[PDB]
Design a binder for this molecule. Structure first.
Ligand SMILES: *[C@@H]1O[C@H](CO)[C@@H](O[C@@H]2O[C@H](CO)[C@@H](O)[C@H](O)[C@H]2NC(C)=O)[C@H](O)[C@H]1NC(C)=O
Ligand SMILES: *[C@@H]1O[C@H](CO)[C@@H](O[C@@H]2O[C@H](CO)[C@@H](O)[C@H](O)[C@H]2NC(C)=O)[C@H](O)[C@H]1NC(C)=O
Ligand SMILES: *[C@@H]1O[C@H](CO)[C@@H](O)[C@H](O)[C@H]1NC(C)=O
Lengths: 184, 234, 50
């Protein structure tokens, strides 16, 4: 159904999430591969998958990344099959040893998979996740910077209260008071 | 009018998609994106102005107390003073808390009528080095010149910052140390509470499946044909 | 130089375009039936003229 160049697989909460910015979709699969053996009459799955992926890698990534393991097939909710091919850039190619193993750790009657007719749920999920991530990030940054600012101004308030303890204490206590320093 | 008129410049039958949801998503995204981007931009600007605004406060502050202001602005405990219009700093020397001793009395017996104004201490730099006489300054600073005196007065009662707490003297006599918890605290801070937007999963939902739609017709022609073409073999 | 400022980094949320997507087109749905009645009729009503 859909060939996808850039498909980002992120693991969280015991689930793989395949997000395509291209088609604006986010699929949700379990953390283990779906065995192509269980597909009733499905050679075109492996054949079309391998051919299409060879064409994509040949077209776009052949000078930047490195193929990591044989293709893996996961079953995403809504009844979608996902052939997949992990990759790793020339930069930080140091971790080919670990990541290849990690992707190889996913391999472990007949059935006919049923696919839903509405892809809108995964598109919503993608939009939500995108926005959520951004707004959460920025607001976090605001919280941090504000927090630093308060401690920064403490230093101002100590000298201020040495200058005028009545007003500084009147603000910091909540009512009109009088104040003076008993040493520190 | 001209601008709109500048848009004017075989046969085909246009094909329309069956799902308008993509443009609706695009509208929702664009709306939200515009709003959040706008507000956060405003925040960035206002914050940026605020920093320059408070610079003016910090210059007078550092004239008042260059040691603390420089200690904050540099990142470590330093000493500082003004060389005209610029600051001069130097890194202090730390001392372990177990190597500092508050003396009992705050009155010098040699000349009565004069009591030290701040409590004097005696400390050591290495755990085997010689002892050094000093006096307690502000914020756990160890002063070396005991020139902080005062005419002894009745009613004397003082707390001084010591270690991670305080020390309490009554009538120039060592009463007792006292940790931070036993003094009612006021705050100069302004609170702000930000909780991240939690995750949310969208489950697939269909009002009608295509099997119900195929079953909507009162007579599926194919099934009728398959049933009725079995009469001779049946 | 030392600074009295506190940093804060805000980057605008970039634009994103939504391309139209369909799992099944209505032509595939019309082709889902094993026998489109109309096409069978049109073929079979040409026998005399053919
Ligand atoms: C900071 O975050 C929220 C307010 O935005 C408060 O957390 C919730 O408070 C409600 C009651 O108002 C509790 O029932 C919930 O258990 C709290 N947590 C969540 C996740 O909802 C919290 O109280 C705020 N901080 C303060 C000091 O009030
Ligand atoms: C301010 O904005 C972002 C952080 O929110 C940083 O910009 C990106 O930084 C990454 C590395 O962390 C680079 O690969 C990207 O090229 C940067 N730009 C974008 C659009 O992603 C930026 O570094 C932050 N400022 C500072 C001083 O760190
Ligand atoms: C994921 O695993 C759970 C637990 O076995 C199962 O109920 C669920 O159907 C699986 N989802 C898949 C394979 O998409």
């Amino acid at each position: 159904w859909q060939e996808v160049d850039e498909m980002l697989r992120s693991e969280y909460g015991g689930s793989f999430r395949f997000s395509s910015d291209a088609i604006s979709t986010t699929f949700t699969t379990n953390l283990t591969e779906y065995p192509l053996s269980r597909v009733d009459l499905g050679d075109c799955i492996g054949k079309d998958a391998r051919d299409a992926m060879d064409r994509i890698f040949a077209r776009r990534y052949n000078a930047t990344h490195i193929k990591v393991g044989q293709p893996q097939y996961y079953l995403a909710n809504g009844g979608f099959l996902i052939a997949y091919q992990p990759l790793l850039s020339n930069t930080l190619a140091e971790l080919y040893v670990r990541e290849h193993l990690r992707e190889q750790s996913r391999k472990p009657s007949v059935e006919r998979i049923k696919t839903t007719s509405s892809i809108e749920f995964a598109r919503l999920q993608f939009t939500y996740n995108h926005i959520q991530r951004h707004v959460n990030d920025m607001l976090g940054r605001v919280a941090i910077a504000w927090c630093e600012l308060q401690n920064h101004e403490l230093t101002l308030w100590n000298e201020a209260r040495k200058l005028n303890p009545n007003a500084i204490a009147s603000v910091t206590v909540g009512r009109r008071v009088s104040a003076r320093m008993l040493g520190d | 009018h001209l601008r709109e008129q500048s848009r004017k410049p075989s046969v085909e039958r246009i094909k329309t998609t069956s799902s308008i949801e993509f443009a609706r998503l695009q509208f929702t995204y664009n709306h939200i994106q515009r709003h959040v981007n706008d507000m956060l931009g405003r925040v960035a600007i206002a914050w940026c102005e605020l920093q320059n605004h408070e610079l003016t406060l910090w210059n007078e502050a550092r004239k008042l107390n260059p040691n603390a202001i420089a200690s904050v602005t540099v990142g470590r405990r330093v000493s500082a003073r003004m060389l005209g219009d610029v600051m001069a700093v130097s890194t202090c020397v730390p001392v372990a808390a177990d190597n500092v001793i508050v003396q009992n009395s705050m009155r010098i017996s040699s000349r009565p009528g004069a009591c030290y104004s701040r409590p004097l201490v005696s400390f050591r730099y290495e755990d085997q080095g010689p002892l050094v006489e000093g006096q307690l300054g502000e914020n756990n600073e160890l002063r070396l010149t005991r020139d902080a005196i005062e005419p002894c007065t009745v009613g004397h009662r003082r707390y001084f910052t010591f270690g991670g707490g305080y020390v309490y003297f009554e009538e120039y006599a060592y009463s007792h140390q006292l940790s931070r918890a036993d003094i009612t605290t006021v705050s100069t801070f302004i609170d702000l509470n930000i909780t991240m937007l939690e995750d949310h999963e969208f489950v697939p939902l269909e009002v009608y499946t295509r099997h119900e739609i195929k079953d909507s017709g009162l007579l599926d022609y194919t099934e009728v044909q398959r049933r009725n073409q079995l009469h001779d073999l049946r």
